Amino acid sequence: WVSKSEIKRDAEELKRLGAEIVDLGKNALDKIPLDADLRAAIELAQRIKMEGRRRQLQLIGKMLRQRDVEPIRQALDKLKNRHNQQVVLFHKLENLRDRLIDQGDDAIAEVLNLWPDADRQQLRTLIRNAKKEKEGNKPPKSARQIFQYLRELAENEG
RNA sequence: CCAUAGGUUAAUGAGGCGAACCGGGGGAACUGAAACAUCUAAGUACCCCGAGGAAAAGAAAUCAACCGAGAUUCCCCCAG
RNA sequence: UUUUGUAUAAUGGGUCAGCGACUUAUAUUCUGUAGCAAGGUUAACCGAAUAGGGGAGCCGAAGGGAAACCGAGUCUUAACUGGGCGUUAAGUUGCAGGGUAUAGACCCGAAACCCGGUGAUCUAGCCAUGGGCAGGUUGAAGGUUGGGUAACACUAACUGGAGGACCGAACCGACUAAUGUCGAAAAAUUAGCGGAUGACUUGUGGCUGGGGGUGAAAGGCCAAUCAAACCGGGAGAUAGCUGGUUCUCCCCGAAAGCUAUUUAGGUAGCGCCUCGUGAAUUCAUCUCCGGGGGUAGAGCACUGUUUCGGCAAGGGUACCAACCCGAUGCAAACUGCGAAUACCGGAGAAUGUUAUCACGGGAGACACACGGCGGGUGCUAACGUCCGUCGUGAAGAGGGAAACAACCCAGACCGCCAGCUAAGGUCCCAAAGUCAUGGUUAAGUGGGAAACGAUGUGGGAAGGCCCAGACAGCCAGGAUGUUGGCUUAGAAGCAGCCAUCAUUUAAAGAAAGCGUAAUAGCUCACUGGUCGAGUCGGCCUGCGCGGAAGAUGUAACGGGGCUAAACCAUGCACCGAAGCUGCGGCAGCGACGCUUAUGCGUUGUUGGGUAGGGGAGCGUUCUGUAAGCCUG
RNA sequence: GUUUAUUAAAAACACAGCAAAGGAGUAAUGAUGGCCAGGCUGUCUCCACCCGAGACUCAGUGAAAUUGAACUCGCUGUGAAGAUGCAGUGUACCCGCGGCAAGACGGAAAGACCCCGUGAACCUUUACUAUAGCUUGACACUGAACAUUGAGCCUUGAUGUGUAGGAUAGGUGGGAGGCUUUGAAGUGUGGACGCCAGUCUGCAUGGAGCCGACCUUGAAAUACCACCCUUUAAUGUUUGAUGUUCUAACGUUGACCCGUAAUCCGGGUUGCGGACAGUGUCUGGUGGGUAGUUUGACUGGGGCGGUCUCCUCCUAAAGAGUAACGGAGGAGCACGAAGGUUGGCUAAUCCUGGUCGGACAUCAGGAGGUUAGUGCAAUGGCAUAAGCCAGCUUGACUGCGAGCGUGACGGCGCGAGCAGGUGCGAAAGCAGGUCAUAGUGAUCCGGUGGUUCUGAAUGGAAGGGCCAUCGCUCAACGGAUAAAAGGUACUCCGGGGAUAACAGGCUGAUACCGCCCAAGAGUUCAUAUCGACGGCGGUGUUUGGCACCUCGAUGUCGGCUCAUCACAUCCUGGGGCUGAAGUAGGUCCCAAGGGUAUGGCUGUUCGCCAUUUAAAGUGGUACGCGAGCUG
RNA sequence: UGCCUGGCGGCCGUAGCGCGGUGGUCCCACCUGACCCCAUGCCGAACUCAGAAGUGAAACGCCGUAGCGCCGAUGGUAGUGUGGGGUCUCCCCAUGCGAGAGUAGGGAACUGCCAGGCAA
């Protein structure tokens, strides 16, 4: 016995995967192991829009009902993992910058712990300049300099 | 150094108010779709600028079709 | 008003007077009317102008197809014996009206969103200036004088006056109780109560302004309004929602059903309602005829289900048991059978204002309730819920059931101080039989209630014993071992193992009750005599009694009261409605004899009515008629 | 110390401490949580009296909520279901004054509770949609010198044998005269490619002659050239990524001077950075921080649970149709054959005999006429067989299709027959799918193939139109978006008793009580007292079933005050039986005149505990009584 | 015209089964061989081809037999439409229709066209 609710949920997951692969760019489609017919359907869906595009996506999901999805799911998982890693690194850099702007020496300690090679004097000078910019409504030159310095430190560490 | 900026004096003009109309710069929501996001409402509501008695536009780098009309503006058809 | 439903104790109204609700424009469809007619008609504009020009333009006469294109033909097809759309019917422009679509579009009512401005004299915080904190206490740091150390530490005496210190006034606050809730006060008064030198309080003047301000942080305060202030505009936002929709009369007159819905309290199509046109003895009741059922009933051939017995595969042969066989049952999901109704079609007399169908305009409604019948469900309980048919209410008053929509009789045109009748009634309330005949009842049954019980009473069929004398009564008998063996404690007939013998016999049992440790004793089955005629036990039942106790007051005939004024059978009379008939009066519908834009010498019938549809009218302001008429 | 101005002052909050311009086990403390002890008393048994203001009478002034109208009694039953107005019955002279409040479902607020609205408003997020902000890279402000290096256009030079061979020749080609002392053939030798087959040149002795089709070849000879692919190299060119230096852009809220009695600003010098930073467009990413929305319906109130489309049977009451969150089962296929024709054949279940083999394999005979089979759950039908086998085939075809069934409609199904061309069979004849009933998705949008149908001047083309076909568990399956989850007790708005919770009203499964039969218990004996197995009744004293009144407001558990009524009687009173010697009791009948507790635990009803009485009764009255009282 | 047979039908259990008797003059059946036509998922089994030697055994046709199967009244009863009544989870009254089962009884067929043989 198979529950209609489970079948509907599986269909929804298949349609979501189809929409994701359609959204993905040319390089992603090339990397993913998609057959010729599926690639043609994806290209047609990308070319078309509107209800026609959604029903082409539904056709893709119906085809995926029969065709295996494990390699496609693995490729999507790897791509999303890489993207999430990059996004998390960017978010952590932004958090470092924000805490440096707000607190000061407390964030300098964390920055030094994360990257011993970081220059404490330069970080303090940049933080003081950023505070002066905040007070005097000056452009975020110091904030962007701190962001670039953190990016360079992260790249050197990696 | 020159010179400029700045300063002093003389002459002309504006400074604000006024109901609506005109052009321009901004500019919504309610509501309809029996829901609602495109859309509509709407370039309407409302704010600002300027002149006038009207204003704006105005003499095609336009139409038309290879037949032909020769600025702009306004009214009725073409036309739901 | 809403409801299946309201006197409901569901909603609104204190009353009077005035004001208040389907209007307006633009296009479309239809109806009536008016001119023209295969033509009709003009917009803007001109116009000494409601005239006349202005044919720009719009509608139809020709449609088919997507189109090319064809043409009273055209699309499909390679094409039609074909099939889909047109031909044989006249449209147009106004006037008025019924709808349709947009404008706030029948009227009042939201919370809510955006735009532009006003608020920190209340209050939250902050900034600058000043003011206030009666009085009395605790009393550290520190300093001086001694004891005590190499120096320390520690300790006693004097000065000292720091504490978000203590008690307690002003001041701040509101923790408790009472009063005040249409109070003196839109958070107040009395006595207590905490702080009362600070993070305290306060006067004055400013700053922080609405998705914002402030907030020792409660979603608290921001001018008595704050989970997004106040004021003007979008804006008459929207409201599938609640309420209202105002003069009269005549005719007709439903539903709460099926399909679909982000769809259930709304909406779209159909059935149902109304108006008009056109159509066939069209439709309806019934007699007959040709029809198919699997329902009621019946049965178990089949499908299940159920009881007994046999052979019994197989399983563990005193033991479980398949498939089958014989008999007995049940089925909405069984029919070897099978109705009554109902439905279809045809023929036929009669009646019904065509009561039938097609089209067009307008609808309304799409919450149904109750009772009977056959059910599903629930508990064959529910004023419970869901089905199919009928009936009433909704939308129908009237008479009876005391009162009570859904029970019974019966469909109100109007008036009459006329008669008849249906249901129900005829002792009084209260109109009619204290009517007659033949029976039942002793119970207030009638006038609530079951399982069961009973010499209640009436009758039917019978049955047993009966003047060779029955049943019950009356002076009589009921003696002997059987103190029994047996479980010896005593059971002896009165506790049980046990037989359940035998003589006198007109006659009696080795034993039924009361009473003793058992005894004993008193009775009874049966047997003598008189009286003596009927007596005894069961079935069917009509009408009666118990089972039968509730709460404001008899309260389970309506009451009085009734022994017939209670129940069954029959009959004759009467009361009994808005039902029928009798008289007169009004209006619609169809006909014929005639009037022919209308009377009818007529004729038959109809006239309850909600939502709703059609038709006909009354009233008021203004305008022409109207410088006419009435009028000090 | 502060906190919800305006009833919540706390362990909560806060604190010292500890870890674009511009919170020091703890002394003390506490209107703090809990326990114990003493005093005190009107909190209470139980309340009595007195003092002042009202309340009462008189004189003067003088509102309010509410109001359909009232000539406005109780009881019984009915009724939209609790009657001042209905039917019956009893009672009551008319009209005032001081009180209580049981009611008039009494006044208050278009219920805050529950439901609905394809309602609103905030808050949350890995709901949808976006975006402020942040940010990546490219382009411009943005330059100059240098050190390399990836690559393109070329300029310039070699290099490149399947087999044929003087030859480590790839393609056409102006095709056939040039090279000549612009120091010749060949040479000591340096060097490049190198399948070791055979080309070559910076330089020179010498000194100025060598060569073209000529013989094979799918091409001929770098003799002159026009110009290139695999394979490589010197100069010049486009250049970018990266690195170093400089200033003239740009920054300077660094310093000095001036306008200037000037922390603004502008200008002049200088110092420090400097083509970095920043800004503007685009772009990748993040982004409940912000903003606009969504979160379906049936539902025995709502949520949860289950379902939303199609097929078979019943309910479905013998035409058709007919609902339930009613009772039983399936489906979103499959077959190029399991389809069409021609021909042929006919099982299940049993008995008999037979090696494995056995009850049940396969073989032969007997009964049997379908209980077999008919691909899929079931109905019906199927001997002509629609059931099974073999041969041939694609009619599972094309354009139609009269006439009907079926639904409101979209739509679905049947269908003789016309024309074309086919398959089977000699022929008559059959074939427009499957024995039939589930195996499916409207429209918009487009993809694919054909069609001059059209294609906005013409000739085309793009784009459309038509024919065929493809694309949705759009399963919420007549499918509102291509695109959406929750909380509100901070809530708000319009309504409902159309729909709940307390009560009211109907019924009585459940609950309590009474009774019929009587097995049996009771030392023998059913009925002194119980009494199983069974059955019949009364009450509305529990849980219940319905939702008929009430959501334009009926105050729902307790305690105090006040009580009233039924007896299914707790005591007192009158009796019967007894397994009643008497006191004391056990069971049942009549009897409601009277009475029928106090304290510790709870809010408690109830219940447990201790002590008394004759007892400390059961229930109805909106589970009595808040216009009477506390909460 | 009748005793017979075969084919094509109407009619379909009063029509079919169980038992006995009866037929080879014709027709029918059984039967012989299959080298050939034809066929066995193997077999002249079935079908097909050339004969009829032999026979009526089986089957087939006719008669009898009621032992079954089957048909089957009349009446009664159940049931039911209409209008009423009641001691109303059921029944009764007037009217109309009217079962099923069972019994008496019937029953072991009838009929249409043609062809062939016998006797007329």
Task: Answer whether A3's CB lies under 8 Å from A11's CB.
Answer: no
Minimum CA–C1' distance nucleotide for A60:
D471
Minimum CA–C1' distance nucleotide for A146:
D277
Q: What resolution does the deposited structure have, in angstroms?
A: 4.2
Task: Answer whether A60's CB lies under 8 Å from A42's CB.
Answer: yes
Structure determination method: cryo-EM
The gap between A104 CA and D257 C1' (Å) is 39
